[model samples]
Target chain A: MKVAVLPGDGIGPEVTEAALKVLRALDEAEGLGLAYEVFPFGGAAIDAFGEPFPEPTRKGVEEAEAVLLGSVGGPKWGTGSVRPEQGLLSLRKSQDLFANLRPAKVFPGLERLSPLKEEIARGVDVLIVRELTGGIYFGEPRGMSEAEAWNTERYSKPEVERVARVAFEAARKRRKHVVSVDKANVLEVGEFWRKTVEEVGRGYPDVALEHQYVDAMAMHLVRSPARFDVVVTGNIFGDILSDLASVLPGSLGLLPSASLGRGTPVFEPVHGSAPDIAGKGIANPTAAILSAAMMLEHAFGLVELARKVEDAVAKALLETPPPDLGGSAGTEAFTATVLRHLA
Target chain B: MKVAVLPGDGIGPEVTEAALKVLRALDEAEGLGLAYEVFPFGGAAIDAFGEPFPEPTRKGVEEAEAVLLGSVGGPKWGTGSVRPEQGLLSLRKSQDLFANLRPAKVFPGLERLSPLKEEIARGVDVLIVRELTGGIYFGEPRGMSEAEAWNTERYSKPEVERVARVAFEAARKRRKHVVSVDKANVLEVGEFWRKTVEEVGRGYPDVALEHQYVDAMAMHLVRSPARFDVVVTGNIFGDILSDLASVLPGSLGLLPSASLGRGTPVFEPVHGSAPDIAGKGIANPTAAILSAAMMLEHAFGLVELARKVEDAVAKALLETPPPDLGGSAGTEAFTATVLRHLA
Candidate 1:
């Protein structure tokens, strides 16, 4: 299958190269034809071609079976005109990538790096299925004027149904418990969210569904994060909740994410471009490398190959952990160590 | 001065009684003529008189010089014909209590109870000012209907201005730094919030003003809570942030809150009725007693009296903390110990 690759900007190229190396190793070991085509996108494309998201990049990604992107924005390009985020947002909109699957787990090797107590960090595993396209994040009437400013927070029956279905499907595969989170106690949007999820949830009789208010859910996530299974929420709430969940095991470089639709799926690391450490060859590449593993598992349906990549990462980190994970190895050294384990 | 006291249903009455014992001691010691006329409200009142918020109780609080409440709501009163939270909502609306103050401090005696490492919890102190009556919590167009569900996140210029001015004035009296939290990136309500606070902030040049997105602020509070001085936000964000902030130092029972209006101010603990421990006589009354201490400080301008009460409580907790704080003291025992320390 042909995958559309976009080494977007800043550290994107470096991390994507490391991820590609791991992906290629898996393809060769499995004797599979996992062809890929790389493209320049985001602010780099905008700077070179005068448009952040050029027509060519969008067209290429639309036709591929899957997409892999690295970091997107940097300090050089202000969020002034056709901002860097517009490129990724437009791509997700155009491709109909509605479900964002962000899984946070605590590998034994990185246990010391956890922000939580070591005991709380021991059994941490969470799957956050965020509704990407709808909710308050993209709602209408969102702008500022001299007199007044406003932004809309809207969700429809269809939007809620689509995301709820995805969450239930995910639950069926994992813990069979789906946590439908919203602010139903206070907001009308939340009330709408509850009724729609309950209505759609009847179809998935095997899945056990529970509703929690957004505020309560936020407190619960921090107070006792181990209790969650498949967490599904609207765009904006999910954005914040997912970030908070990621911090449990600390080391942002260990988290990986995926954006999936009926067409090609896009996988990327949850970390951002650290401009301060760029070009130093010390930026941790584990998140990006692990994103490639996610791409293999979900997009290509190579579960064993994904496990092999994960095992190799665990083995490598155990032997020589990265700085953030409480060891001495930098980016290139860690990537090479993982490559050695894979070999 | 007459203080209207509403020891609402569940553990509310139990903890309020414990707080009253301390308040009586303070009033007598300071030679202050303080009259507390008790009233029935919340689920208990609904069970007794078929009205969640009885007229007499409302009138008592409305006419008094100040109001002190334990809490409202309980799981026993199912969310059916009469909602348990309606009484608290009505109280806030009836009094026009626009500014909700939640001060969080990791006192020397209770620092070890903090979830964070010892170093991070040692010097934590913060005051959060919440706009109580407005924003998404009470926004219009909110309901679950057949065709469509809706909740408007509405905020008027005056609504934001009033709360901003309250926060700024409070900040000036304390550390002189105000961090306004909003979601200007996504919500229009937040845009209006940031603009109004920024504009109103010009009135107090002595206080340093800063802005943070509500989501990022949540992460910051949990990660490094000691960095904040005074924080201000709208209703929904405030509700969640305050609860999460309370958790930073220790259990919810250690923090007190005050809701201020034009005439009289209302003080209470940051915790709910804690229905699970209702009638068990195991509830922590420190938060309630602290609320009364804050009432003495803010309402009557009794600085020395407030400090004395706070000091005695601190001394008592250090000598023998409650079970939750890793000591073997019951609710009444803790209260008596605090009073003894005062004597």
Candidate 2:
């Protein structure tokens, strides 16, 4: 597997390094040829080349088959014209990374921390395939005046069709049930979304397609999340739903995400950079390690090895919990435990 | 107090009557001068005058100081442009009804039924003030072609300020705090929203104001519901949040909502016209009764009398539970139980 690693900012580098070590241990046993090169990006890249998404990193990302991101942005760059988030956005913009995949699965030991009762929380393993580029978040005619502020929300037939196929393809690997969320009852655009998604679902006859309103989906995500196996929606809707789903597993610090479309696929943890604990030595590596697992399964097609890494992380979580999960283990201590469990 | 009662469709008439009778029992004791006129709307108006919002009902709505809506729409009119929902939308659009209020409070007897643990669910009384008329739902330049679809989302300074005042005004009556939700970190319009709301907040120094991102608000709604007393947001955000908050109380059949602006304010239950159980005479009327309470307080300024009715419903729920809450009491039986406690 060829990888371009961008260990961006805050707890990112700390967590990213731990995940690589965990992946390194499983190398010979699985006979997986793993090759990765680190590059400057985000704050580091801005410091190095006066640009967040510099020429060197851009070419390096193009050369690699997969990109691994370790979060980005901080107060340090918020005031400047050269912001850290632009690095990630430009990368995505250049590559056309339209489909975002986020999976929310409850680990065996984090049931009590879920807001939902133990019974309802224990069996939540839901995937959300969100269309990232085309929605109100980036829609045209968006700006503010002293009297008003406005943004447009639009979706092309191709945009909806492409994302719908991605959801169906992802669902085929899981329970094969897909719930397409929209607000078709009111908005004209919403009806377009519903019809477009339905047209795409016809090709995947084996998968069951269910229609749900955005409002009801919010309640169901917490009420009976297990009922949803693989769910999909547009940009703005996904922005709210993805974060909501991420919190369902008790901690945002333990899940991974993947963004895919027309260019190199990118894998990363679901959590943010978490500047508060950037150098505290208590940053949990569980999400980053799991992100590497996604990289292995998705980019490298090493499903068994990915599962092996995930089980090791889960085992370590249950046996010697990290500080993020209410235990005393530091960052490297948690990393060491995960590596030892690789046996 | 004069009310234009629109018992729209299905279980609407039954629940509307239940709520009215409960209100009558408290009338003489509180010395409330009550006068109400019923109107045909939704499917009923289509059956009566061949139009949902006919000339007579439109004129009558103008005559009344407040409007009480039971529910609207079902399978009967799901086929054409002459839709049932258009009747209500036309009502709001004509009247400029811009602010919507929905409150979710876990009743004492129904605490155990919440998806959240009993402890977290016990004190969750949250009120959401949503911008009803504007935002992407009704934004201009919105329609779809064979290839693409688009809608605009915009909020004026006046629009945001009007809703902000409603939230802070409502907050003064309760916890004296409001959390304004927006996507300010990303969207330019969101930043406009944040700035406008904060500016309005300065006028009300007594009420504390906090801002939160929409995604975090979604997770926070389920994770720590009690911490939120009153929240205000744009149309799309509230569309998702109001329903999510309603479910936190475990039953959607027992909450009320209010819409206010430059016209007659309307009160209604936060539920749809359940066609399956409409004519069974076993429908729960708790939400309708609560809607009446909102009418009493908001329209006639009968705060104490409204609380008296709410307490009566709570009393009935504990002494003789409703079928929706896992008990055998039918519609009138539950209403009768609540009426008995009014003495």
Candidate 3:
């Protein structure tokens, strides 16, 4: 499989190196046949071509079957002008990567890392399927004046149906349960979303469907995250709830995400580029490696290979916890541990 | 103080009676000069007068200096036609209650009851001041079509400014720090909210101000709730975040909420009218009693009286835990313990 590697900025390059090392090991051992095309994006692209997502980088991603992105942006590339995020957003818009899937699973050894009590935090494995392209984020009639500001949270039936199907299909692969969250009691758009998701559920007979209000879901996630299997929601609610779910695992560095829609799917870690720890090599690479596993499963349908990579990472984490989890293992050390487990 | 009492539905009257008994005890002992005028509301009002907020009830609430509400709605008053929530919503609208203050505090001796790990949940005292009147909930241009549905998340400067002022002023009375939450990076309405809150912050020179994106704030709240003092936001974000904050304390039966604006401030518990447990005489009354304390402080400005009530409840909880907290104390038994503490 051909993949685009966009190691955007800061510790992105370092973590990307670790993830690449794992993929290289797998390719050599099991003939995984993975080919990567390196491309400059984010701040690097901005410096070279005056835009975060330069035309050449866009073309590079388009040529690949899937994209593996490291983190993006730093204080150096201030948000005021020529921000690195512009490239990420442009890439998503260009590729139509509408469904963002964030999986938050608390590893057995890392349960103590969660902010929740041990009992409440234990055994939590949840996947948040977020709609990325629609809802309030990209809604029109959005403007701000000195006296008032307004934005529309609009959802076409197709928008909700597509994302709902993604969640249902995802559920069938896992626990066969999908909890569609909305604010139907308050927002008309939410009612539309709920209705559409329920209609979509009719197509997936094997999967069980449940509906929850966004606010109640927020509370339930904290109280009993383990009760949820696959959660789907519109853009804005997904943005907030997914971030909240990310915290349940305790270590943000250990979470991986995938955005899928048109063209090629993109996989990335659920963390930002830590400029302060860029050169120190202490940044955790587990999420990046896991993102690679996600690409193997989602992009190439190599479920068994993905499971092996995930098992290797879990074994490595069980043996030697990463720095973010209060262990002393650096990025290289952690990567070597995973490689040893793979071997 | 003349208080309008709307003991809503199900467990509402049970908890309300407990709260009133506490008030009666205090009044008899300290000559508190508190008087209450009972009025039918919610399902009871609907059954009596075919409306949740009847004309007599509205007039009674308007004439009172403050209002104390029990929880509202149950499965019996399902949202089919004349739902119980309609009365509650109508009351808030008619009263012009624009600011919703929900304080989530981990009471002393109850730290173990929090869902968060002891280290993270301890010392969490936050006041969420939500703009109640004008936002997406009441915004215009809301409609649903066969293919598309949309709702406007609009905020006027006055709407945001007034809530910001309430937050800043609230911060001055607490820890002198306020964190304003919005999705400024993505939504124009968020930008408007942030800008307006910043302008309002200028007036409270003694209070410190901070801004956080809604998603980031959701993560931070679970990670470090104690770091926040007063958090102010528009309707939607506030609804989700406040509910998320509520779970930090573990027991919803101990949380109180207040709605402030025009006619008279309305205080109630943060829980629903649990019908299954209705008339069981086992419902926890701490939240309702605490709501009365909030009414004492906010409406009558009886700060010391409110503290006495709070301290009494705390003392009672320390001595005899409620059933919700895994203790054997029933509603009447718990109320009697609190009354003994007051004596």
Candidate 4:
């Protein structure tokens, strides 16, 4: 696997290094063919070449089979001609990353840490496929005036179809159940979305299909999260629901996401750069390591290898919990434990 | 107090009758000076006058000091030209109800029923003040064509300012804190909402104000529901978040909501009309009775009366729980228990 590594800002470099260490160890132990090309992006690229996402970094990502990104943006890089987050946005746009897959799985031995009752949090394994390219976030005719401001939630048939297919295909690999969430009762865009998603469901005869309103789905996620296997929705609702789902696993530092479309899919940790503890050497890197596992399964189609990596992390977590999970292990120590479990 | 009572459809009349029984008992015990005028609405009105929301019902609501609505809509009234939900929409539009208040509070001795852990569920008294009439739900320039469909999330300064003021005023009566939720990081409409709410916050110096992105707020609602006092948001976000908040207490049959604007405010149960259990006399009436309490507090400004009503229900639930709460009390039995506590 050829990967482009973009270690962006603050605690990003530390977590990325920890993830790479595990990858390097896997390459040696299992004789896995893995190569990485490091690139400057985000605040680092902006400072080096006066641009957040430079041409060199774009070229590096294009040549690689997959891209692994650490968390980006900080207080220092937030107020300039170009902010650090712009680089991440530019990368997503350039790659045409339309479908964002966020999986919230509660690891064994970590149910007590969840805010939900132990019974409700246990055995929760849900994957939310969110349309990332369209919807109100990027809709046109968006402007703010003194009196009023407006944004559009517009969706083409193809946009909904493609993401619906992604969710259905994903459900087929795990549990054969897909729940498409929209607000068809009120919004015109939601009506179009439900229709398109229903049309796409005809192709996936093996998967069980169901539809729910976004508001009702939100309540279901909190009330009975275990009932859902795979969920699909538009950008804004998915944004809110996935974040709500992330907390079911107890720690924000344990979730990883993959954004996929035209070019190489991007794998990244869900937690942002912790500027507060930049050089403290205590940042959790489990999510970054899990992102690497997602890249293996999604980009390379190596299911067994991805499972091996995940099992190793789960075993390490159970034996020697990370600092975020109420243990006293730092980044290096936690990565070492995973490496030992892999061996 | 002159109140317009809309006993809508299905289980609506049963629950409404239970609520009225409690009100009548309070009137005799404390001389509360309450009088109700009954009106048919939803499917009942449709069958009577060939319209979901009849002219006479509208006039009754307009002339009253406040309105109490039972749940509306069912499978029978779900199809054809005149749907049952149209009555709710017409009533809201006619009255210009701009603010929706949904309170998700876990009554004492009922924390175990919450989806959250007992410790996290205890003392959760969040009132979500949502903008009802504006934002994407009622925005114009919304339609579907062959290629693309669109809906607008539009907000004016005045619309946001009024809802923010309502939330702040509500916080003053409770915990003196308000967390305004928006998607300011991505959407222009969100930025406008945040700006307008902050401007409104200046007027209420006694109440503390904080801003949170909707996605983050969703996670926080699950992770630490008790940390919030009153949360305010625009239409769509509020719809999703408030519904999510509703499930935190584990029973939808125990939640009440109030909609306030130009004319008399409307109080109703958060649950819908259960057609299957319509005349079985087993439907929980706690939500409807709580709606009466909200009317007393918000419409009549009788805080003590509202507290008395709420405390009576709480005491009844603890002593003789309803069927929905795993007890054997039917609608009549539960209403009688609450009435006994009131006496």
Best by DockQ: 3
Scored by Cα lDDT, where does model 2 land? 0.88
**Pairs of colliding residues, candidate 3:** none
True contacts kept of 3: 0.98
The digit string of per-residue lDDT tens for model 4 on A1-343 reads 8999998887889999998998898789777788998899888888898888899999999999999999888777767679988888889989898999999988877789888888988888899999998898888779999999999998999899888988997787778999999999998988898888888899989999999999999888887898999999999888888889988888888999999888889999999888888888778888999999988888887777788888888888888787777888888888898988887
Cα lDDT of model 1 by residue, B10-94, tens digit: 7889889988898888778766888989998888888888878899988998788888888888777876787767887788788
Interface RMSD of each: 2.3, 1.0, 0.7, 0.8
Better of 2 and 4 by TM-score: 4
Q: How many residue pairs clash in model 1?
A: 2
Question: What value does DockQ give for candidate 4?
Answer: 0.84
Candidate 3 lDDT (Cα, 0 to 1): 0.89
TM-score of chain B of each: 0.87, 0.94, 0.93, 0.94
- Cα RMSD (Å) between model 3 and the true structure? 2.7
Give every collision pair in model 4.
none
Off by over 4 Å in 4: A42-56, A74-79, A275-281, B42-56, B73-83, B275-280
Task: Give the per-residue lDDT of model 1 (tens digit) for A104-190.
Answer: 887875666665665656667788889988776777645556654555678888888888988897677667899999988767788
What TM-score does candidate 3 get on C-alpha atoms? 0.93
**Could you give the CAPRI-style class of model 3?**
high
